Design a protein around this ligand. Structure first.
Ligand SMILES: NC(=O)c1cn([C@@H]2O[C@H](CO)[C@@H](O)[C@H]2O)c2ncnc(N)c12
Ligand SMILES: [K+]
Length: 540
């Protein structure tokens, strides 16, 4: 046992768990100290006054507007209804009826205890007629839309005039603070990327755990990849999906550019396939993972963006067992009506169209989904052996010519979804046609997978990683780069560095404050709902 291997993980595991100060800096209350509201006049001018952004999408602003609504009983009742419609939207599909009636009898009646007077009588009656017809979780959608149409009016304008929006401006003043290497503390390397290495890092003030994808400036230049780096960053930010790694920071360094990403302490799937017992795992695990991978691919294809690099090592597991797609550097956004043409990908996972320099759309991803489902069931790549040292020229040859081979491990449904997703003609490939992912979601393979409860987070993952385990190779077994030489950086690269490095992302940052309880603890106003001194303009 090598000491460096041991110490590297015992440290990571200690920070991961916690536990005094929750892992925060000793002076975190001074770092995140609110400015005086008099310091937020610039923000006052530039902030866009949007109800949906300031009172729902922006996490801290959604809680500050609810705190304002709960200051007046006339507005709190609405917040109660909306919260009640949320429960009904995630309650048992059989108990919908009784709970839908509870809401109807609690909020939408002439003398209901918490009567909402802006929903509209026709609407409640329409909703009350459909109550019987059949109970669906979308039943109350319109009622809540009527509440939001009323809250975006006078209530929103009064919030903007309140001390709670002043507090939001303070929070935003903190959000926009600069990011730097001193903002985080780096831990062990979790894996090696294309331009650098992924590490585990921790925000020093909040204690939140992340993963830093370092992209070494010299390496980006040596390999002409300045557009791949920017594309990955812009992509990660544009996308929103519970099944794709999300971006929270993006800062620059003397020698590298960094992407702070969601940490996946469960590890990558290649590790769970080859370094944890027998090759491959059970179909049930493969079912769940393939389903979420598909969901993540549906979220990407909504923005007409292809991935082109689907392989086990780019699928990760989180604290609970759900997965996300990780290296979006090879992804591109095809023109909504045009197709692309580039031989990009990892051998054994490049689809036939991408192998003959043909032109393709969002197609090579469904080939990659089949390559995965096969590898998770069998224990090898469909067209290559585990440790076969086959020249990749031949690996190509096989995928276009030979046909994959199945075994007793594959079920009838598992063998079909693979054989349809591995169709060597894009037109005739499952999902590559017209319906889209919906043709996959019906396949006999997923005959027991409710992609609705899956996309909602109701299904429990099959495998749950153990907190006191590092589902990763040892640090000394991670491959290393070869020192770059002769690529001395200059000025013309400074324009791309400034465009890449945009600081913190708004919504992730605010979530980080909520989760770490920094918001909870520092978002204190005065006694009996009085102006605190940092919001009082009569004196600092
Ligand atoms: N999203 C990423 O870029 C990540 C890459 N790795 C590791 O780094 C390796 C790079 O291929 C993977 O196999 C993982 O072990 C990660 N490990 C944890 N969280 C992450 N967000 C990543
Ligand atoms: K295994």
């Amino acid at each position: 046992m090598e000491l460096e291997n041991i110490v590297a993980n015992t440290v990571l595991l200690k920070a991961r768990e916690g536990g005094k100060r929750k892992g925060k800096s000793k002076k975190w209350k001074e770092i995140l100290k609110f400015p005086h509201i008099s310091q937020c006049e610039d923000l006052r001018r530039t902030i866009d006054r949007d109800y949906c952004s300031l009172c729902d999408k922006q996490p801290i602003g959604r809680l500050l507007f609810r705190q304002f609504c709960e200051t007046r009983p006339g507005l709190e009742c609405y917040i109660q209804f909306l919260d009640s419609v949320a429960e009904y939207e995630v309650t048992p599909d059989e108990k919908l009826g009784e709970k839908g009636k509870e809401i109807m009898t609690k909020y939408l009646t002439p003398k209901s205890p918490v009567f909402i007077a802006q929903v509209g009588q026709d609407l409640v009656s329409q909703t009350e007629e459909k109550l019987l017809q059949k109970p669906c979780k979308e039943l109350f959608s319109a009622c809540a839309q009527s509440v939001h149409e009323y809250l975006r009016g006078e209530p929103f304008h009064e919030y903007l005039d309140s001390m709670f929006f002043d507090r939001f401006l303070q929070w935003k003043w903190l959000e926009r603070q600069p990011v730097t290497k001193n903002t985080f503390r780096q831990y062990r390397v979790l894996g090696k990327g294309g331009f650098g290495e992924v590490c585990a890092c921790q925000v020093r003030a909040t204690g939140k755990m992340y993963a830093c994808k370092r992209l070494e400036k010299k390496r980006i230049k040596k390999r002409k990849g300045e557009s791949m780096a920017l594309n990955e960053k812009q992509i990660l930010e544009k996308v929103n999906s519970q099944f794709v790694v999300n971006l929270a920071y993006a800062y620059e360094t003397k020698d590298a550019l960094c992407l702070v990403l969601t940490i996946m302490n469960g590890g990558d799937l290649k590790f769970h396939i080859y370094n944890m017992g027998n090759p491959g795992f059970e179909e049930e695990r493969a079912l769940f993972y393939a389903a979420e991978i598909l969901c993540g691919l549906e979220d990407l294809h909504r923005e007409n963006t292809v991935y082109r690099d689907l392989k086990p090592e780019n699928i990760l597991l989180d604290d609970y067992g759900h997965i996300r797609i990780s290296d979006l550097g090879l992804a591109v956004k095809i023109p909504e009506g045009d197709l692309i043409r580039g031989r990009v990908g990892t051998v054994g996972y490049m689809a036939p169209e991408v192998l003959n320099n043909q032109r393709y759309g969002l197609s090579p991803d469904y080939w990659g989904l089949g390559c995965l489902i096969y590898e998770m069931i069998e224990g090898q790549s469909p067209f290559r052996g585990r440790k076969e040292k086959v020249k990749r020229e031949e690996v190509d040859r096989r995928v276009l010519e030979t046909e994959e081979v199945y075994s007793h491990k594959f079920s009838e449904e598992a063998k079909s979804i693979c054989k349809m997703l591995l169709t060597k003609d894009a037109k005739q490939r499952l999902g590559c046609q017209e319906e889209g992912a919906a043709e996959v979601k019906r396949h006999p393979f997923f005959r027991n997978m409710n992609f609705k409860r899956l996309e909602a987070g109701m299904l429990d993952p099959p495998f749950v990683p153990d907190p006191r385990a590092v589902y990763c190779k040892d640090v000394l077994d991670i491959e290393q780069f070869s020192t770059v030489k002769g690529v001395n950086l200059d000025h013309t690269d400074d324009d791309f560095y400034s465009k890449f490095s945009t600081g913190s992302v708004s919504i992730p940052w605010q979530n980080e404050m909520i989760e770490t309880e920094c918001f909870k603890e520092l978002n204190v106003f005065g006694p009996n709902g009085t102006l605190p001194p940092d919001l009082n303009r009569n004196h600092p």
